[PDB]
Paper text:
S is a large, trimeric glycoprotein that mediates both binding to host cell receptors and fusion of virus and host cell membranes, through its S1 and S2 subunits, respectively. In the prefusion state, the S-protein’s RBD domains alternate between open (‘up’) and closed (‘down’) conformations. The receptor-binding site, which can bind to human angiotensin-converting enzyme 2 (ACE2), is transiently exposed in the ‘up’ conformation.
In addition, [name] was selected for its strong enhancement of protein yields. These mutations were combined with hinge loop prolines resulting in two combos, a quadruple mutant S-closed + Fd containing [name] + [name] + [name] + [name] and a quintuple mutant S-closed + Fd + K986P. The S-closed+Fd quadruple mutant was then imaged by cryo-EM. Further processing of the 320,000 closed conformation particles allowed us to obtain a 2.8 Å electron potential map for the closed conformation and a 3.0 Å electron potential map for the 1 RBD-up (one up) conformation. An atomic model that was built into the 2.8 Å electron potential map confirmed that S retains the prefusion spike conformation. The two structures differ by 2.2 Å all-atom RMSD and there are no significant differences in terms of the relative position of domains or domain conformation. In our new structure, N614 forms two interprotomeric hydrogen bonds with the sidechain of T859 and backbone carbonyl of V860, effectively mimicking the stabilizing effect of the protonated aspartate residue, without the pH dependence. The stabilizing mutations and presence of K986, which interacts with Asp427 in the RBD of the neighboring monomer and Glu748 in S2, allow the S trimer to maintain predominantly the closed prefusion configuration.
Author numbering:
A (entry chain A): 722 to 827, 855 to 1147
B (entry chain C): 962 to 1147
C (entry chain C): 50 to 69, 80 to 95, 101 to 108, 116 to 130, 168 to 172, 187 to 209, 216 to 242, 263 to 620, ...
Amino acid sequence: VTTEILPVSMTKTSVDCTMYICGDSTECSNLLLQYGSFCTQLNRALTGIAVEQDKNTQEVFAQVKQIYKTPPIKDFGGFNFSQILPDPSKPSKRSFIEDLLFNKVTFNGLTVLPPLLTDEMIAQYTSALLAGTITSGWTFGAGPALQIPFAMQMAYRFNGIGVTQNVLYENQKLIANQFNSAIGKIQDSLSSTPSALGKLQDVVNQNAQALNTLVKQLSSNFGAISSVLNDILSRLDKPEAEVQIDRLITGRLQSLQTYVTQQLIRAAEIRASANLAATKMSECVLGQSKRVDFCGKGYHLMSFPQSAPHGVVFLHVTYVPAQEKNFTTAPAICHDGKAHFPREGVFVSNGTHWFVTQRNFYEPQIITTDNTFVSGNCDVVIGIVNNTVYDPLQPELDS
Amino acid sequence: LVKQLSSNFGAISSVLNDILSRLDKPEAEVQIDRLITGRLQSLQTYVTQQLIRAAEIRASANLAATKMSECVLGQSKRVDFCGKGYHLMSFPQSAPHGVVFLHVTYVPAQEKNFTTAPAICHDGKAHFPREGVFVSNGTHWFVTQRNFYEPQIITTDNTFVSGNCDVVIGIVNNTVYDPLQPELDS
Amino acid sequence: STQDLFLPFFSNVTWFHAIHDNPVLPFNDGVYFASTIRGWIFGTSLLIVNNATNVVIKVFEYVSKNLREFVFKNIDGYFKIYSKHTPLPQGFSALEPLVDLPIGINITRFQTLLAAYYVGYLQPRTFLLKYNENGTITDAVDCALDPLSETKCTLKSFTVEKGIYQTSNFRVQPTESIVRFPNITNLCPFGEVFNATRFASVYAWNRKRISNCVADYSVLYNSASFSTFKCYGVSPTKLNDLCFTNVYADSFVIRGDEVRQIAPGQTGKIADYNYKLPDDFTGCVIAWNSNNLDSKVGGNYNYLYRLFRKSNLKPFERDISTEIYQAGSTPCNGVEGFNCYFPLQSYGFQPTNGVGYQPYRVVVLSFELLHAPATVCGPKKSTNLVKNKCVNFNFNGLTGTGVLTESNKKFLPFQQFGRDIADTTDAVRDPQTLEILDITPCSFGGVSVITPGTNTSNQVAVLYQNVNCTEVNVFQTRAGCLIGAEHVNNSYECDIPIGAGICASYQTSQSIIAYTMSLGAENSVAYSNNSIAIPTNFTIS
Ligand SMILES: *[C@@H]1O[C@H](CO)[C@@H](O[C@@H]2O[C@H](CO)[C@@H](O)[C@H](O)[C@H]2NC(C)=O)[C@H](O)[C@H]1NC(C)=O
Ligand SMILES: *[C@@H]1O[C@H](CO)[C@@H](O)[C@H](O)[C@H]1NC(C)=O
Ligand SMILES: *[C@@H]1O[C@H](CO)[C@@H](O)[C@H](O)[C@H]1NC(C)=O
Ligand SMILES: *[C@@H]1O[C@H](CO)[C@@H](O)[C@H](O)[C@H]1NC(C)=O
Ligand SMILES: *[C@@H]1O[C@H](CO)[C@@H](O)[C@H](O)[C@H]1NC(C)=O
Ligand SMILES: *[C@@H]1O[C@H](CO)[C@@H](O)[C@H](O)[C@H]1NC(C)=O
Ligand SMILES: *[C@@H]1O[C@H](CO)[C@@H](O)[C@H](O)[C@H]1NC(C)=O
Ligand SMILES: *[C@@H]1O[C@H](CO)[C@@H](O)[C@H](O)[C@H]1NC(C)=O
Ligand SMILES: *[C@@H]1O[C@H](CO)[C@@H](O)[C@H](O)[C@H]1NC(C)=O
Ligand SMILES: *[C@@H]1O[C@H](CO)[C@@H](O)[C@H](O)[C@H]1NC(C)=O
């Protein structure tokens, strides 16, 4: 179980250009009128960014038609999702890991606009996706939700990675124990390491730094006798106060344009990240992905979403092979001058004689006419070996 | 951008000919420099915003190209990349400054509840389905494909054996019809 | 979109009757007029008459179902008239101008000679004009009549699509003005430094330190005794409303035409050898001829200057050195002669000299705008102190606007100002008493207008962003204060996003409703450990 943290949105800001530049002075406002519609462009740009943030959140999290609920009794074949399912005790119906994540990300015309979706709404969406994956699998993302036992779902997914479903049903307890242990280890690795959420904190810090620079830039003279419009106006007459105020306007307008340009660029970056998070919610959560390294490291089984401040955290559950063994193998087998190839798997030998096994989990089986298919004679394949192929009808053919 | 030419930017007029037809070189130069400063700032702003919008449009176009390659020239297993549902095929249609994909998908419908088992015990042997699931309508057990109810008799052809029926959790007892013995008239 | 004096839409125009005598009318910045009355007296002068053949106008003379609509106004004396023959009903009918009188009468009255008529006044009201293809105003929008018209002006359209638009910025206006100067009474002794008997000579210019007083610089630039009275970094006009820490009157007497050397960045004799002002000088220079007493017959050589100096000077340093000046390499050691000069010489001031030669008294008033307590203030009256209200305060000469409150900030006895990240005064100390009060910018925010499409309706809701409803049918969000929306307890798909989970829609007697948006239809999958749902059919989507 591995985490992937993706930023989805950033803070929605608005700046009254005419109030940042000209606080409440009407001399300065009339003097800024003759720069045209720069203020309108700036506000339009920032408003577009702000709308885009809510759009990104919708695209990532609003991927369920209905709000699915987990049953009261959590009998999931030994699998325990208590740490990722919502806690009804808390006022905000958040999971333990979501609470853990939310504790680790910490005028002059500037306002911060609230997001359209509250953290509670996002937590509801995440709980719905979780419940859908737990109760219905990948069906709820492709149509109506169709209930299926969780062990049978995980067998489906095991087949999806090329491992027979007997392998899960015969190791169900071990697989559940491994999963629950890995979730606990996620809990711990997150609660301890401080910079696990560096990406979201970085988004936050970038925004704060930009705003602080913007604000400090009002203490600059830009060539004028003072950085305070009132002092200029309380000391000078109209014709020369106008000169000083024009200097200040030029400077503050340049500063604000720099801010807005940088924010547009960062918003494009964040939009890319949110589109990636949306694709991962569709392909990893609402389905089983064959794409390598797209849903974690290993053969992807299933991902679980968790809300985070301005972002999403995917818990990718993958199958990692282990405890390798060396065998000698062959592409085909000669039997009665016929070349046999494995329908599904490989021919291996422990040294003495030959078996056929599936490629991702050693499960040796007798080489029969059911595990193999014939194509040609045994004089054209490079590496073909001699061995008997057991037809399971002749010894049965007592009649 | 065009309206930004009606702005003075501090000059006495926004019209160069007026400044040139009214003032001599030394001071007309001052006023024209104000106008140049402002109009150049406006043009730089326009170009920067256009670069940013062009980046957005390039991203959208690359997405559309990926969708033409994967949804139209092939059949995609990527969920929600080519419409909602199990994707069958997409068709393109040109549009002003863009493309329109008609995604044809298969959406399951008319669900039915069944009771299921992961495996079946027969002769001390655990049978699992090669392709599909075991279901029961209440009386007999059948094996069907997972996305369309099409029940079939559980045979030794619809299933494979792996182990005994004491390790699978939820295994049920039911007969597995070998299609050789009643056929074995000889 | 123009910004002119218009008749605001849907306003109260008086209706007068003449027959049971024309009544008395005022004339503000402008006037409207209509009728079913030929003539219009003015004054505080102008007169118009229709002899049924040509209009006659006098002051100057000029000659040239009748809803005869008229508009009159005066701007810098120019008197504009507009009118139209409309055959107060509905519709639009723009008024072409007919005449302008470019003379200029101060008008504060209005009359009429000769029925029933109408009168409406004009205010500066930004309008959005709709010129049709044929070039005629066929429609208009008053940008301040209502929120919908403000939205139309902000979008520059007559149709508004459904949505939420921030149209302007709300901010509380000040209730009253405040002035807090120190309780000082003694006048600054300006007559002394100005009417002194003998100003020290330019090489030993004498610097009086005016402090702890009330200076009235009004009388300085009122008196006409000064040939030159010119200030840098400040205007004399506004000197009576500034409070300075202290003033330095550097007085001396100099040559007649070497006066313009007393200014920042100046180079020459007195600048670089005797007295220069810093390039950041903030203060006034006063120079006036002293031929009346200073210069006498025979040569008044009792006023000195320093001719030779080995190098230049700092701003504001004095040299009382009388030591000889050495030009060559041979030491002099106190004896004149070969290359041994005396650096001090004497002005030759006789009334027989030229006009650009007489002695000029020069006093340079240098001001320091430090943050120490202000001692030299202006002749401005202090007022009372008002807290918990947006006011136009003036503490020790620094203006501002905001709400004053009791602060718990621990100013140390030497501090007089708090300061913000943006060099904004966050807190201040009263000069009259000694207490620390916090300054806070009185509430502001954006004003968004929730409107369905103008096709659907014309009523709107208004969102005051990030403000309480107490400083502005009414419903408080975490996005601000909504006005004009009904808060239902239901939950629907979001139509118009307000924020913080709140959406707004036009529906039911249609109205604007504000609700908490729903994420979707609840559902509970019938999950059990031995149940599976399998499809029996499909749709091709
Ligand atoms: C599968 O669904 C289709 C509808 O998508 C069903 O078709 C309809 O059948 C009814 C009566 O049988 C007709 O009145 C409709 O005109 C049919 N519609 C179409 C589009 O063919 C079909 O019967 C369903 N099959 C099953 C087994 O339920
Ligand atoms: C699930 O795990 C939690 C620890 O996170 C534990 O308290 C709880 O008992 C577990 N539930 C089951 C059924 O094992
Ligand atoms: C396979 O044999 C090689 C022999 O060089 C050895 O290095 C390797 O560790 C063996 N692998 C396993 C999984 O035992
Ligand atoms: C190989 O496997 C067979 C059957 O599993 C066993 O009989 C034989 O002893 C094994 N030999 C080696 C070398 O592992
Ligand atoms: C494998 O390599 C050995 C020697 O390295 C050679 O004798 C043998 O024929 C090769 N077999 C195949 C299938 O290439
Ligand atoms: C396999 O058997 C055939 C005949 O049965 C023989 O010709 C061939 O050499 C054998 N191959 C090996 C590797 O022994
Ligand atoms: C399956 O049974 C449950 C019982 O809780 C029921 O709610 C659900 O509608 C059933 N499914 C179908 C497709 O009828
Ligand atoms: C289940 O199906 C079998 C064969 O299709 C039928 O004989 C039996 O009656 C069915 N039982 C129920 C409960 O529908
Ligand atoms: C399913 O749950 C029931 C009780 O709710 C239990 O008796 C049965 O053994 C369970 N079977 C499986 C396969 O979990
Ligand atoms: C299945 O059959 C075996 C013996 O044939 C029996 O021991 C076992 O209890 C049966 N299982 C059930 C669920 O009846």
